[PDB]
Write an enzyme that holds these catalytic residues in place. Sequence first.
Site, PDB file in Angstrom:
ATOM      1  CD  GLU A  11      -3.066  -1.028   0.135  1.00  0.00           C
ATOM      2  OE1 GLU A  11      -3.000  -0.151  -0.769  1.00  0.00           O
ATOM      3  OE2 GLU A  11      -3.986  -1.871   0.184  1.00  0.00           O
ATOM      4  CG  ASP A  20      -8.235   2.865  -5.117  1.00  0.00           C
ATOM      5  OD1 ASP A  20      -8.786   3.154  -6.206  1.00  0.00           O
ATOM      6  OD2 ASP A  20      -8.812   2.200  -4.220  1.00  0.00           O
TER       7      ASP A  20
END
Length: 162
Positions: A11, A20
């Site tokens: 991440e 994202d």
Amino acid sequence: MNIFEMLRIDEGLRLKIYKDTEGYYTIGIGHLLTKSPSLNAAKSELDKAIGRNCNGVITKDEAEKLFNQDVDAAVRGILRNAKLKPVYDSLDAVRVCALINMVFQMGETGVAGFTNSLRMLQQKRWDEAAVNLAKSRWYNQTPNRAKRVITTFRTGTWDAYK
């Protein structure tokens, strides 16, 4: 290695709102804020999460607080889900991290839809599961991460992260 160090790799750390791989507003260590296209909506969710006017920006401590909450939530999601709990039961201390990693990224409901691969995992068919997960849209969309997660399922080692 452990689930926190694993997800930290997958991440990264970002202290400002970004989008994202699905184009969704996100902050910190993979903390999904909202699926709304509105940045103002994202910021409202952020301010509620932290409890202050963040103006789209957080601290590292604030990111770690959310991160701890988010891994916990992924685990609870697995434990409560009729499709996911039986899989969890078959996974050793390393392989269980790959399942948590998937739930972290996609959510309980999203992961619970991998019916066939999940059955393979529940039955300890590691190689079958790895082949079948490879394929998926998940893999097509984020192959770098998916490959690493798949190797963890396949081998029960941290080799893809080292």
